[PDB]
Every structure is written in C-alpha cells, then in structure tokens.
Amino acid sequence: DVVMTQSPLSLPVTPGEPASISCRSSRSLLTSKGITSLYWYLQKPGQSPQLLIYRMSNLASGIPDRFSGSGSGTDFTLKISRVEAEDVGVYYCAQFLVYPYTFGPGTKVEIKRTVAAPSVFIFPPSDEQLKSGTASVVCLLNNFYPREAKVQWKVDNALQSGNSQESVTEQDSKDSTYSLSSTLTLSKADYEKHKVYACEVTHQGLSSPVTKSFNRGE
Amino acid sequence: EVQLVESGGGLVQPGGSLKLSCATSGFPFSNVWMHWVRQASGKGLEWIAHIKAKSDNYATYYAESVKGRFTISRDDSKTTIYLQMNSLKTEDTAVYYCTGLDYWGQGTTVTVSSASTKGPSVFPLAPSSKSTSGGTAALGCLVKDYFPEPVTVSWNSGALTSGVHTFPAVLQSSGLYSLSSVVTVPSSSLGTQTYICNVNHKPSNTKVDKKVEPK
Amino acid sequence: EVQLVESGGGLVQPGGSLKLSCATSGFPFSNVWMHWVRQASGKGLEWIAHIKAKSDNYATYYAESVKGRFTISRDDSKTTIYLQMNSLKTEDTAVYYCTGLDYWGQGTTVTVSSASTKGPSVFPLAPSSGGTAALGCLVKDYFPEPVTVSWNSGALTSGVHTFPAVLQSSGLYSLSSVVTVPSSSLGTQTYICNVNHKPSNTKVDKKVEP
Ligand SMILES: [Zn+2]
Ligand SMILES: [Zn+2]
Ligand SMILES: [Zn+2]
Ligand SMILES: [Zn+2]
Ligand SMILES: [Zn+2]
C-alpha cells in the first residue's frame, strides 16, 4: 500500500562519471526513533540482490565508499561517485516500515562505452536435430554495443518473417557489451528444399549490414 | 560464513501445493528475522512474507497477494525457514528468495502450469571456423524442447568460462523452451582443446554432456 | 573480444623437448608484439622471450637462461605464437603465459621431471542438526600438476575451497577439495566432486554421500 517510485528507470552512464538514482515513497519513512526505513539494493545480472545502503544513509559492510545515500522523508537518492563497469545492474529502493513491505520498480544502470560492432557467426542445423524432424539455424552476435541491433534471416535471398526468435544477454560486467542469439526454425523438409541460409546484421557500429551465410551441403 | 540455500521449487498444477525450504548456517539463529521475497522473470522484487523469532512468538506477516494461501514457518533446531504454498496460481510463478534483508539465498524456481515436465534435447553447434584459419571461432549447444525453466549449462564441468554466453531461453510456439549456449575461442585452439557442454534439467532429471567438435 | 589461449604443456623427461602454442583472436595480428613469461609454483614472474612483427623481420629476443634452448616463433596466418623448448631442465618447470604485456592468457603448465604420469584416486570426505556441515573429496597420489576440481559440474561455487596440492615423500601430489553447506541442505541437494587430471586421461565424478 506504500508506493515506492524510482527515477530514472534507465540510466546510461560513462564509467568514471557520477550517477544519481532517486526514490520516492507515498508516505514518510521516518520512525519515532528517528530511523528512516529506506534500503537500497543492487541486483547484478545472474545474481541475487545485494544490500548497498540501509536506513537511508548507512553503508552496508563490504560496500565501497563510491556509494552513498541521502534523503528527506519521502524523497531519497542513491549516489555513485565514480561509476565502474562492475556496477551494471538493477538498483531497487525498499521500505520495511509499513506492511506490506514494498520495493521500487528498479532502475537499470547501463554503462556507456565506445561503439563496438558485433562479430557474427552462423550455425547450420545439426544432423542430430534433422533426425528429429526440425531444423534450427542459429546466428550469434558477439560482444557488441550499443544493444540496438537488427537481425534479418534470408533463405535463398528470400526475407523470412515470423519464424525466428531471439534472446539478448544482459550487459557484461567487464567490457560492457551485449551478445545476442537468433534462431530460425523450419520444418526439416523446408530446410532441405533451399540452399543459401544467411543472417544479415544491422548495427550502429557497422557501416553497412554484415551477412554471414552458408550453403546447405557445402 | 553465512549461507542461505533455498530448495523445493519445481513445477506444479494450478490449485496445487509446494513447500519451500531455506537452510541457513554461519550465524546464531535464535533471534534473527527472515523473509521470503519473489521475482518473476524480467520483473521486480515482491516481498511475500516475514517471520520473527521465538521472543516475538514467531510472529508472521504476509503480502495480501498470498494471505490465506502461503504460510511462512521456521524450525530453529534445523536453522531453516519454510514457505508452505497452497492453492497455487499461475501468477505465483517466480524465483523465491530467502533473505535476512542483508544476506540473500540463490533462490529456487516455482512454476505453476497445467503443462507437464519435459526434458531437453541437446544439439551441437559445430565450430564456425577450422584450426588453420586464424581469428575467432564460435561453437555451442542448442538446448531445446524443455519445460519448465530452469536449465543449468556449464562448459567442461565449469573449467571453461571465458568467452561463454548462455542466453535467456525463449518460449517456443509449442510451449517448450529453447536456449543456446555458445563459446568463442581462437581458431587454432580448435583441435587442441576438447569442448563439452554440461546440461542439467533438474525438473526432468535430465543430465546430458555433449562433446562439440569441428565438422 | 581479445582471447589468448596457450596449449601444449605437459610432462617431459629432463633433456626432452616440447612445443607450446598460444592461439590468439579478436585483434589485428600483423603488427602486434608478443612475449612468453613463466611462473614457477609459488614464485614470481620471469620474462622468457619476445617476438616482433613482420616489419621487424620477426626479430626475437631471449632470457639468458633459455638462449640456445628455446625458440619463439609466430604464424601470422594462424594468429598464433609458439615456444619450441629443447634440452629442458627441471628449472624450466612452470606455468607459461603468452602476453602482449597488456592481455595475458590463462597459461599452460610445463613439468620437467623424471617422474612418470600417475592418475589420482578420488576418495569422499563424508559430511561433518542445523548449523554448518563440511564435505569434500581427497584427490590423492597423482603426477604431474595440475588437477581440476569442480562441484556439481561448476554449478556449486559458494563455500568451495580447493586447496593447493602438497608433494608427498613419494613424489606424488595430494589435494583436498571441500565445501561447507547448511546441514539441512544435506537432505535436499546432491554433491558431486568432478575431478579431471588431463596428463593421465583421468576423469572421475564422485558423489559425496552422508
Ligand atoms: Zn491493501
Ligand atoms: Zn520454403
Ligand atoms: Zn529456395
Ligand atoms: Zn563473447
Ligand atoms: Zn569457507
């Protein structure tokens, strides 16, 4: 019932630069003992949440001096003085004063880095899968930034639509890049009808689309 | 060292029941307060339940979303807390964390679905290049047609982590998940290293090790 | 993505020969200079050799103690550098890294010894209500180093300690790998010791049961 809001929802930042995440509660979190029941968490990709700041301004044990918290009753600020690549992830505020306890929706920190075009790889369907009646063609985009990227599938130069799916990683905690997987799925019979399989990649780091392809059976 | 370890997650019918455990160690348990917090895929954190200690008469508190259906409890002699979940709904699907609000477990996954368990097929993604080509090669495993999430993928029993990407699974039109796990290596590395992807799908007790070799 | 991957290490008799490879990828190779640097167990870094690029006539340079025994070379078309090691001595035992002096590979282990390869035996260290239990596996009587130990195919890393190997009076190594867990998790989780000793082709998975 107590509403925790956050701004921004997405925060791009160049390493070495400061970042500020704001939080707001729909009512005061100050207690009769003068505690402000406001807590800050960071959840890194693939990990459970991690406490950074407790009761508005207290740094949890192990947490670098880079992190500080401040606030005025219902408005609070998590501050990072020198953002590092390792700080990528989702930052949550929370109140543990009025049941039901509540978290903010999270602010995703994005590390800004130099544009990096993807390296691109295409994998034909395995013979093992073909035996099962299906054919998946996989296109890998590796170590790129920014995240925005367009993958187009072409079979015998025909543009495919509606028969692929893709997945993107979270941002890497070391080099601040992304990778992406796209799978084109066909009947085995339809795979064996056509010759040229290509994935065409459009990305800001590429002066013109890159195409990786193969001919079925060499 | 403080350790919190959740267990008991799995696939269950709407309307069904499940009991989660959180085994703890590394700290005096008698006066510590604990919580369950859950997170659905791609979504934020949702506090679910709070249980206090003996001197508080093991007082409990619940999110409105689970009241009358879930029961948080603790066994001080086994330094463990539990989440009894009854009348499960599809909306209850999420990773469930046990936490003291400072330390958090790794989480256990609960999936509420009328679908049944199905183990994956594991197919090789053959090396892109050859060994005399220089430059970068990519190889991987396609882990397809499984339910429910999650699957664990390692390479060379965990010895290989540099260059690995294990992608979020996608739900196929068939209602079954698929994912790929890839690794890049220097082309000349091919044919001097062996590459095996280790797939574990606990809900179905499928374990598969697939050697991926150049075609 | 920059990658440097060394290979070709292993066990060799005194006076023997071995060729190390360092396969690279992720960067234009034609004008990059590279080095081999080695590190004996518990000891510091020792520069071994340097090789320049084609426009430098692939000039090479060596540490005093390997001159006339080792040769650094490169194959630009395979983006790979090499270390041919002849007349090996026990003092050459070490992990060998290739490096541009900024990026480094993970290294490959070279052992120069008259001992022969021996694969380990793997024994459970059985778990020891509430509170903390510890369990492990004893990886005994192997040669040479290294051994790789993981738990649950690498899905278990919290609480794990894989200790440095000790050399026994027999000339063989022994090590332990242990993990601590909450006692209640002993009834809800399986614990498997994955041991790999490449020099002996020894692969053992050992379930450690209460
Ligand atoms: Zn209400
Ligand atoms: Zn067609
Ligand atoms: Zn066609
Ligand atoms: Zn990568
Ligand atoms: Zn420990």
Ion ligand 3 neighbours (CB, 5 A) are A 156, 194
Write the burial class of residue B36 (CB in 10 Å: 0-12 exposed, 13-18 middle, 19+ buried): buried
Q: Which residue of chain A is at minimal alpha-carbon distance from C2?
A: A143
Task: At C65, give phi and psi (nearest 5°).
Answer: -80, -5
Q: Measuring CA to CA, which residue among C193, C182, C12 is closest to residue C92?
A: C12
Write out the residues of chain C at the interface with chain B, using a CB-CB cutoff of 8 A.
Answer: 1, 3-5, 7-8, 21, 23-26, 29, 76-80, 106, 129-133, 148, 150, 153-155, 157-159, 180-185, 188-189, 194, 196
Domain identity same for B175 and B88: no
Q: Note the ligand closest to the C-alpha atom of A1.
A: 1
Domain range for C197? 121-207
Q: How many Cα atoms within 13 Å fall on the side-chain side of residue C170? A: 10
Of A50, A101, A142, the CB nearest to B138: A142
Residues 6+ apart with CB under 8 A from B161: B155
Asked if the C-beta of B148 comes within 8 angstroms of chain A's C-beta atoms, the answer is no
Strands C192-197 and C148-151: antiparallel
Are B138 and B79 part of one and the same domain? Answer: no
Residues C98 and C190 grouped into a single domain: no
Q: How many CB atoms lie within 10 A of CB A215?
A: 10
Nearest chain C CA: its distance from B189 CA (Å): 6
Nearest to B180 among A103, A124, A138 (CB): A138
Where are the CATH 2.60.40.10 domain residues in chain A? Answer: 4-111, 119-215
How far from chain centre, in Å, is Cα B38? 13
Residue C172 · residue C142 · CB < 8 Å: yes
DSSP H or E run through C168: none
- Of C81, C112, C143, which closes a domain? C112
The resolution, in Å, is 1.9
Strands (E), B126-195: 136-146, 152-155, 164-166, 170-171, 177-186
Total number of domains in chain B: 2
B202, two tokens: 């606990």
User: Are C97 and C130 contained in the same domain?
Assistant: no
Q: Which residue has the tokens 């596996």?
A: C137
**Residue B148 · residue B41 · CB < 8 Å:** no
Identify the contact set of chain B against chain C, taking CB-CB distances under 8 A: 1, 3-5, 7-8, 21, 23-26, 29, 76-80, 106, 131-137, 152, 154, 157-159, 162-163, 184-189, 192-193, 198, 200
Report strand pairing: B164-166 vs B170-171.
unpaired
Residue C163's Cβ-side half-sphere holds a number of Cα atoms within 13 Å equal to: 15
Question: CB C93: neighbour CB atoms within 10 A?
Answer: 19
Q: How far is it, in rounded angstroms, from Cα C110 to Cα C98?
A: 13
Chosen domain end from C112, C140, C173:
C112
Tell me if residue C178 falls in helix, strand or coil. strand
Which of B87, B112, B137 is the last residue in one of the domains?
B112
Alpha helix (H) ranges present in A117-157? 127-131
Q: Please state which CATH number belongs to domain A4-111.
A: 2.60.40.10
Q: Tell me: do B126 and B84 sit in the same domain.
A: no
| Contact between C163 and C175 (Cβ < 8 Å) | yes
For domain A119-215, which architecture applies?
Sandwich (2.60)
- Lookup result for tokens 């574990």: B200
Radius of gyration of chain A (CA): 23
Ligand nearest to the CA of B64: 1
Task: Please indicate, yes or no, whether residues B125 and B83 belong to a single structural domain of this protein.
Answer: no
Query: Based on the domain organization, do B101 and B125 belong to the same domain?
Result: no
Rg (CA), chain B: 21
Identify whether residues B156 and B183 lie together within a single domain: yes
Q: Return all residues near B103 (Cβ < 8 A) that are at least 6 apart.
A: B2, B4
Domain check: are C99 and C14 in the same one?
Answer: yes
Residue B138 belongs to a domain with what CATH number? 2.60.40.10
Query: How many residues are present in chain C?
Result: 210
One domain for residues C108 and C137 = no
Residues B97 and B125 in one domain: no
> Which own/partner pairs from A98-101 qualify as long-range (CB within 8 Å, at least 24 positions apart)?
A98/A1, A98/A2, A98/A27, A99/B50, A99/B61, A100/A1, A100/B47, A100/B61, A100/B62, A100/B63, A100/B64, A101/B35, A101/B47, A101/B50
